[PDB]
Amino acid sequence: SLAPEDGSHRPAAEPTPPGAQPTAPGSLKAPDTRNEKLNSLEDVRKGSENYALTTNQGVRIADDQNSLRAGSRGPTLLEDFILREKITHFDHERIPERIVNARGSAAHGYFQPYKSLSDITKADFLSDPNKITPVFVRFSTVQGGAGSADTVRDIRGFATKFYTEEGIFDLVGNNTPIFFIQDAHKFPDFVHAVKPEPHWAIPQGQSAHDTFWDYVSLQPETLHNVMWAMSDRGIPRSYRTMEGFGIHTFRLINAEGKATFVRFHWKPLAGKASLVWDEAQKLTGRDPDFHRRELWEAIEAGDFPEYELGFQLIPEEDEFKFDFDLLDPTKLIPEELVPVQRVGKMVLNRNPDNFFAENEQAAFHPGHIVPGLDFTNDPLLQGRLYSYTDTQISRLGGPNFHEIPINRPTCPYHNFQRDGMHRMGIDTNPANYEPNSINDNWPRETPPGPKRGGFESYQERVEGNKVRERSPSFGEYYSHPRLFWLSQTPFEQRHIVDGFSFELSKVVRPYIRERVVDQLAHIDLTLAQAVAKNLGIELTDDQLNITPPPDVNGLKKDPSLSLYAIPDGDVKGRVVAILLNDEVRSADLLAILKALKAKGVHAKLLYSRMGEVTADDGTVLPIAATFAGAPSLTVDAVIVPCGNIADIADNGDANYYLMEAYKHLKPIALAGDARKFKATIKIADQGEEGIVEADSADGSFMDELLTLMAAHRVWSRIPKIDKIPA
Amino acid sequence: SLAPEDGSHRPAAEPTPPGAQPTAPGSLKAPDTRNEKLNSLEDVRKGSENYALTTNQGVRIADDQNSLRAGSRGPTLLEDFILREKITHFDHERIPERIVNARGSAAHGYFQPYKSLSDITKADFLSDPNKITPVFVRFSTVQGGAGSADTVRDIRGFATKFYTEEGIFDLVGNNTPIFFIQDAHKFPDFVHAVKPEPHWAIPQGQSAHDTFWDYVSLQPETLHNVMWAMSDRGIPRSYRTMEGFGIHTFRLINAEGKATFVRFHWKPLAGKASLVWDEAQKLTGRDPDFHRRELWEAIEAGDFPEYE
Amino acid sequence: SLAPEDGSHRPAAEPTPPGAQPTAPGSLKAPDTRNEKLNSLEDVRKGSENYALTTNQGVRIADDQNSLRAGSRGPTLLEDFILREKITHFDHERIPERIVNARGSAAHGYFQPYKSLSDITKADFLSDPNKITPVFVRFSTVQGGAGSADTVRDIRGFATKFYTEEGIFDLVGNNTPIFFIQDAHKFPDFVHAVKPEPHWAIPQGQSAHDTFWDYVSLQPETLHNVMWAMSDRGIPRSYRTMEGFGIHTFRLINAEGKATFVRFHWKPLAGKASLVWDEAQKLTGRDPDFHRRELWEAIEAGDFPEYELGFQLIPEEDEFKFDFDLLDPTKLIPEELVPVQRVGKMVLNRNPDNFFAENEQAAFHPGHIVPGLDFTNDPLLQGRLYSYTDTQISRLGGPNFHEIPINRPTCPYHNFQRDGMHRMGIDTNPANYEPNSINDNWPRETPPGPKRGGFESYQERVEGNKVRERSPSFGEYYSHPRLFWLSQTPFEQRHIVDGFSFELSKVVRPYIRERVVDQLAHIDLTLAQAVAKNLGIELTDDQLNITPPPDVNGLKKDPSLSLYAIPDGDVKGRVVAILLNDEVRSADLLAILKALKAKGVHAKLLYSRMGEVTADDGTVLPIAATFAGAPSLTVDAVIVPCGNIADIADNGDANYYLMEAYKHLKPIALAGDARKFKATIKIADQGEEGIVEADSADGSFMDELLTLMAAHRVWSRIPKIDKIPA
Amino acid sequence: ISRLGGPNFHEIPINRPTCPYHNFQRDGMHRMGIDTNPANYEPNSINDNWPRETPPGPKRGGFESYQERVEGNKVRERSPSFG
Numbered sequence A, C: 001s002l003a004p005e006d007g008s009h010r011p012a013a014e015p016t017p018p019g020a021q022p023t024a025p026g027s028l029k030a031p032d033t034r035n036e037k038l039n040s041l042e043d044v045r046k047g048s049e050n051y052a053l054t055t056n057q058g059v060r061i062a063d064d065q066n067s068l069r070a071g072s073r074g075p076t077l078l079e080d081f082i083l084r085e086k087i088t089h090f091d092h093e094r095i096p097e098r099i100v101n102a103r104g105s106a107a108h109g110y111f112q113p114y115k116s117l118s119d120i121t122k123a124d125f126l127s128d129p130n131k132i133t134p135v136f137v138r139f140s141t142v143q144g145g146a147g148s149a150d151t152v153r154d155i156r157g158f159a160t161k162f163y164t165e166e167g168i169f170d171l172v173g174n175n176t177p178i179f180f181i182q183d184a185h186k187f188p189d190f191v192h193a194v195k196p197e198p199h200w201a202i203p204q205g206q207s208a209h210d211t212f213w214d215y216v217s218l219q220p221e222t223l224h225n226v227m228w229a230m231s232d233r234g235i236p237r238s239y240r241t242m243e244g245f246g247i248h249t250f251r252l253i254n255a256e257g258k259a260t261f262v263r264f265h266w267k268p269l270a271g272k273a274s275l276v277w278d279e280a281q282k283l284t285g286r287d288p289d290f291h292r293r294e295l296w297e298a299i300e301a302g303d304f305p306e307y308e309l310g311f312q313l314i315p316e317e318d319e320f321k322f323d324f325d326l327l328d329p330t331k332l333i334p335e336e337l338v339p340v341q342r343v344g345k346m347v348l349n350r351n352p353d354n355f356f357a358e359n360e361q362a363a364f365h366p367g368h369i370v371p372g373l374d375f376t377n378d379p380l381l382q383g384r385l386y387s388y389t390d391t392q393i394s395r396l397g398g399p400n401f402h403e404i405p406i407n408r409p410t411c412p413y414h415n416f417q418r419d420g421m422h423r424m425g426i427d428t429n430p431a432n433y434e435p436n437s438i439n440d441n442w443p444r445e446t447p448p449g450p451k452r453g454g455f456e457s458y459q460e461r462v463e464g465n466k467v468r469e470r471s472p473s474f475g476e477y478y479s480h481p482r483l484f485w486l487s488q489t490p491f492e493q494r495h496i497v498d499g500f501s502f503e504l505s506k507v508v509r510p511y512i513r514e515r516v517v518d519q520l521a522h523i524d525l526t527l528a529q530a531v532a533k534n535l536g537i538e539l540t541d542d543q544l545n546i547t548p549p550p551d552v553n554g555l556k557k558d559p560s561l562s563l564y565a566i567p568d569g570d571v572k573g574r575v576v577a578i579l580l581n582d583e584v585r586s587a588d589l590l591a592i593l594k595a596l597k598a599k600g601v602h603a604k605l606l607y608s609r610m611g612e613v614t615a616d617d618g619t620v621l622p623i624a625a626t627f628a629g630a631p632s633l634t635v636d637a638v639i640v641p642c643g644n645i646a647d648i649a650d651n652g653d654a655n656y657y658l659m660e661a662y663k664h665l666k667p668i669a670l671a672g673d674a675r676k677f678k679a680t681i682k683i684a685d686q687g688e689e690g691i692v693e694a695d696s697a698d699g700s701f702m703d704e705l706l707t708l709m710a711a712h713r714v715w716s717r718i719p720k721i722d723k724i725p726a
Numbered sequence B: 001s002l003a004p005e006d007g008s009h010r011p012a013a014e015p016t017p018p019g020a021q022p023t024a025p026g027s028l029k030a031p032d033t034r035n036e037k038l039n040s041l042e043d044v045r046k047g048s049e050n051y052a053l054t055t056n057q058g059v060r061i062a063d064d065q066n067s068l069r070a071g072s073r074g075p076t077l078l079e080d081f082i083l084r085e086k087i088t089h090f091d092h093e094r095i096p097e098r099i100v101n102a103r104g105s106a107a108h109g110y111f112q113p114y115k116s117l118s119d120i121t122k123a124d125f126l127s128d129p130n131k132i133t134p135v136f137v138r139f140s141t142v143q144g145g146a147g148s149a150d151t152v153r154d155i156r157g158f159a160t161k162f163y164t165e166e167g168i169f170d171l172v173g174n175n176t177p178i179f180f181i182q183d184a185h186k187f188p189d190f191v192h193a194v195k196p197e198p199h200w201a202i203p204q205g206q207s208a209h210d211t212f213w214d215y216v217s218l219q220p221e222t223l224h225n226v227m228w229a230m231s232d233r234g235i236p237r238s239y240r241t242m243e244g245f246g247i248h249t250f251r252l253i254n255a256e257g258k259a260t261f262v263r264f265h266w267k268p269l270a271g272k273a274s275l276v277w278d279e280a281q282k283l284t285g286r287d288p289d290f291h292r293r294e295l296w297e298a299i300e301a302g303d304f305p306e307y308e
Numbered sequence D: 001i002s003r004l005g006g007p008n009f010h011e012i013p014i015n016r017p018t019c020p021y022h023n024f025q026r027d028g029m030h031r032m033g034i035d036t037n038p039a040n041y042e043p044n045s046i047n048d049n050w051p052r053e054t055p056p057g058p059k060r061g062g063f064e065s066y067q068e069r070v071e072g073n074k075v076r077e078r079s080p081s082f083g
């Protein structure tokens, strides 16, 4: 029952490209990657090699293949304590998944600021460019269960736990800069509406159903984040290629006591990139684990996800200077009005060891702040402060969830709290209360001050009556949707129109569709008309005369709201499919791989069967996957080298592979006789931008391909794809 | 008055074909379809039309749109007990999913035997062809979570709760007539091998990964059920068009105390029918809820799943 | 600083007698005491001196006196995350108490065998006289809640966790050698019957109610342990002065595979000693924590509880050599037939640091055996094997209770079990199943062998039909109760009579009393008559002629069954009340205290008030307690020295002190004018056995007193106590 | 929530209101009530927005807090009048 002779069961503990080795727990793949938090988990890491198999009480097991029975065909005996312990632990494996964001993928890394921020905040983790803060990040979808698919259309969660020297700070954000609703009291309404409908629990991972669009049509506050969801923001290529936002306005407090309003941003250093809808939806079927896999593999390859932290900063005296309320989380602050100041860089550089222990049990909370940070009255933030504490007690089984290893602070913690289910800490303090004399009052309160001080809330002025009332300043719902719409490129606008049209086609009750279209007519007539036409709906004269909402503080657009208007492409860590034949021209392949390797782009070698093929020069080429097994959905570009093209010329899967990649706007490159495939994608002989072609794969061919890949997708091909049957 | 004036928001309370009307809870879609179990659930069914919105304590709510704050732009106050109750119930909605067969779709129905089986079993539910036994049946996949896809390649579970006059009998079977392993002591081994791998929790809903095939290769007792899983049996067209089996040999005991060995079968009266692999895998993407949907809609249409 | 200047808040970290210092956490009191288990807990112990007060996330708290509010008389704000974490942890402090034995008191210690027992067992912890095994022992009552009283009449539990090098072994026993019932199936019936009745949840800590005696009257198998319960066995003086028993027959298994039947015994090295009923019951009121307190204070004083482990051993071929069935847990094995062989010694030498974390969360299981031990078919033990695993999952919150620090093995444990609520261990094994090739099949099964081998069950022959049937061999109910009765001294027999009489008086339905009396007439006529008389019941002529049950294998008694038949007193750690007056004769006191100190006997100095008094010669005498504050119930004897006897001669409390102690059969000693107190307890001028008296507290006054204390109580005084109104 | 095992402790018989209770809350451990409402959110059109909010009033009205004036700074401070 043993390992192969050749040690091929065990992956190399060295960075390797996706597919080259079986993936492995982080501490075994990258044992020399350390930080303070990863080190501190060492008390609970358990190995296995050379150890005897035992019960949980330490008793060695002789026979782990059989129950104890009276004779070998007899009844199982109740005294089999080994069987019952093993079955009981199995029987009790599951815990409640998260009520939202149950589907998520996490990794370890570190953060450091570029320069001390002491002028605007006394937060210790921002005080020194050479003081490094361990982090654990979990990225997530929102709607679906923990076993749902990665590449659904949904908002994404982006939660970062900072293990600072002055306490855990969790920054619990999303990949769009606003939320659907204004006041936390409506959260259960909204989430019930987007989640599977309660009679039949359908659909998973999708807003494309009646109840979501019903709530939307009756709650126009939702429309801004709905625009972002229906755009390609809702289908990121990778967690590495999306933006992050805290959404709410928070405060920074400096040593002088000055408060500055702040909104938090993460910039992906790999650039912004999203799938297209047909590709994203098909990919939930071909690989429901695509984003989880891609994140794990990037870290195993050395393509560490990196993000830049950035702050939009607004002085206290400028609180009311915009035509939107800063405390309204359905409103974004355009970068054109308030730029993002770069603050520091976060690098995710190691995977967990056990997904359940570290990812499933991690607990983040936006209420987890530190001195130098504070809240505001944002009525959605205010309610979140209550919710995460409450849900985690039942999800994680009691109030000692901070003792679960992943959640533990790395800085000191001491207090008079005691007991609770699964209490780990054995307190020796003779006192469990303060004030006490019997322990000289330790642990003691600490006055606030410039560093290492106790937490004190900023003394904000509160004046008003106890009311359940939405601020009048929050009652404007169309101008930000329209700013977003106007800031998208034409192809991005088309994909938005296609998102609304596809989703509303799945709404069974037609008046719900009509009411949503009426809401679109309040944002932009061109958008409303394009959706209406796809739905066979005709706008009335009144609808055509709805006056468009005002510009946002004179802005007619802000290109930072577009994924693509401003190029920010980075090809490192992207992947190319190379479609092999049984007599590959080894000169083509040499040049291809050399150029890819120079830019940090990975390759997957594909064929019509598994095993190996032999190139013209005797080189044996191992096959990663079949054309069916690793579809074009899972790669960024396709390259077909010369060789014996007749081997694959009439293979349906190989032809379809090119048709699918072509449809989904990916760069394709064809060398030598592979150019015969130009017929399948049915498109000229002078060639076309987006298809690289040459007698062979030279320097120039690869440079062209690599340039297209830096632009992510071939948008100019869009008019050509409605004709292809794929 | 948010409902459309034409009453088109509400599905007709009569059988209708898939897609013709919005789907609805069973007691509203088919109020006249009754059995003893469904009738006995009446004490806990809760309606809604014409009733005031309240807390769980019965206090009427005036404004379910806003938290209580100090000023309309001020901080939320700890005294907002309406807000806290609503968010707390929300916060605690989830329970652990089933350790296996977490993904499953269920319906109510009824069973009747063709003739009294008193000669071979004193089981009351099988004693009289005029004796009707309410059932609740759940069909499931095995490996994936409750939010995983329906048309994966997997064994299917087929569990029937018989509410008999002498006790609940649960017949907890699968859609193939054998299981992968011999002794329950190995069940955590086998299930761990098929389930997502522990470092990264991949893949969902699939035995197509190293640990499953490592275990199979080292445990040849698995091969028989593996053959079934790799065949089109692993990808049924519908829960209505697959076979059921209790797998184990049980005993029937008659009044004279004679034991007869029995294995249980379910025959789908709609026939046996499966998907093909490329279709099944793509369907997990285009509609991960396809079997759940198909079952619900068949019952709404009057195409009742029948099994012998 | 709130501590006093003089440092009197902090107990001395050295052995001190009961009452001399405040009690403290074990690791603070006795930092120098260590064993392997205590050392292994070090990583979870938490200090407090010199640390800042923080949240559980490590954020320093500035003001731990106030909620955050809008204005200092304003509403509390939801954003107060410091308040909500502190209150939430508080809100969730409790866990379910144990279904039975909820009330218990526990200490750390160590065990060592006297010699290797490798000839009869391959159990590692018994293999070497040099091998020391850490232990954790919890003693308990059975019926009452965690907050019920110690000195109730009840069975006591005695549970020992041995942290061996081959696994945790739990020896989960009682202070009597049999149980009430035969088959585990009836455990909920019996326990429901003894526990508080379900309508009104009365009575706590008492079998004196209808449902208990109803069950007993209908289930004669219970009578054996009921006899024990009604005897003074039911009210021990201290956990230090009771026997322990595993009750069931288990097996020892040697390296050759030979099985030997075994029953386990603990012998108290401090000897056997019990309270009398009126004393025990009042003491539940004056100090409901008396046993818990006494165990803790003995350990702080260095009076470490010591027990000898012993085995009754029966060869496999002698299974049917007795009049009763070895597998019947309502039968004892008389020591006259099978002697107890001494095995080793256990010393409890350290208190916990945190009662909840170490005591409340400890989980013991009679199914936790190690290779070299095995079970038998005892049908009560059989069912136990199921129950403790089940209960502990809900009590302790999931299947990883073995990771709670007190429960962890000190030896290695590795297996393929994963996940579960509150999972601490982070597994790095690429595999979570076996057989596996991807981790070379580690951790691996180990064949059984002479040492360090895997667990294999003894291949006992099983033959018969699947039946719910009691063995006919178990169907004898009276001969063990009779053996027990005949082995008791006449004063122990009287206290048994009075236990049944008092409990049956509290049974409201008269026919239930009648039915119990009829059961007694089947055991012993003298017993039945005496109880009957106290209940106003007359035996019928038929009851009067019930033939008594036969002797047990020829024995008409066994004095090892009696608490007192064979003197085994030890005065070390017993306590004496010394009743002071305002002008004590200092020569009497020096001699008293010097004599007490030499035998390890503690003293408490008592007066009509707190503070101090001054002896005839200037010596300042500090008062420990008032007569009312520390009643005679709490001491083993009373000495009254000479002095100004007039000062307390008419003190109602001081007179009553002597009356109570007289009634409860405690030695009393009176010196010089303290002899005036003879009048209050009606002692004749020439004195009586059990009252020491003289002109001064010595020559042989202290030897006489200490001699009486060695005999525990003055049994000969029993006829005299009825005429004393106390 | 922890003592009684989940968020449906109001369905424990002794705790239940004797007056009507209807809302959009769903699920939670040991859920007894089986909701037939097509909607589990409001505002909804698919159940005509039932169950519905009720304005506060002299009898049978919805709960509205008394509109007490709050003026002060966010402080963790004991009122001097309590001293």
Ligand code: HEM
Binding pocket: A097, A098, A099, A100, A101, A104, A138, A139, A140, A156, A157, A158, A159, A172, A173, A174, A178, A179, A183, A184, A187, A246, A247, A248, A329, A362, A363, A364, A380, A383, A384, A387, A388, A391, A392, A395, B087, B091
């Ligand atoms: C700005 C709007 C919000 C954002 C950016 C957001 C973000 C997130 C994220 C990223 C997670 C997953 C953390 C993880 O990976 O474990 C999460 C979980 C959760 N959120 Fe929020 N959220 C928002 C609004 C709300 C609201 C209004 C509430 C309720 C008042 C709420 C309650 C919850 C709950 C109960 C969880 C599960 C937490 C756990 O089980 O540990 N969220 N949220």
Ligand code: HEM
Binding pocket: A087, A091, B097, B098, B099, B100, B101, B104, B138, B139, B140, B156, B157, B158, B159, B172, B173, B174, B178, B179, B184, B187, B246, B247, B248
């Ligand atoms: C012939 C072999 C088996 C068959 C046909 C089978 C069938 C099933 C089915 C259909 C379900 C889902 C019931 C539902 O819809 O809720 C289920 C659940 C489950 N099974 Fe089995 N099973 C088999 C073997 C085993 C074994 C050997 C074990 C462990 C010793 C096991 C443990 C479980 C557990 C713990 C659940 C979850 C039950 C719950 O949470 O209610 N099964 N099984």
Ligand code: HEM
Binding pocket: C097, C098, C099, C100, C101, C104, C138, C139, C140, C156, C157, C158, C159, C172, C173, C174, C178, C179, C183, C184, C187, C246, C247, C248, C329, C362, C363, C364, C380, C381, C383, C384, C387, C388, C391, C392, C395
């Ligand atoms: C020879 C007869 C028995 C003896 C000597 C005995 C002894 C004990 C003791 C000493 C404890 C307390 C352990 C501790 O201090 O934490 C205990 C707890 C317990 N016992 Fe037994 N017991 C007996 C019979 C039974 C039976 C027949 C059952 C059920 C079939 C049972 C079920 C339990 C349960 C559920 C607990 C609570 C365990 C926990 O919560 O950790 N016992 N027993």
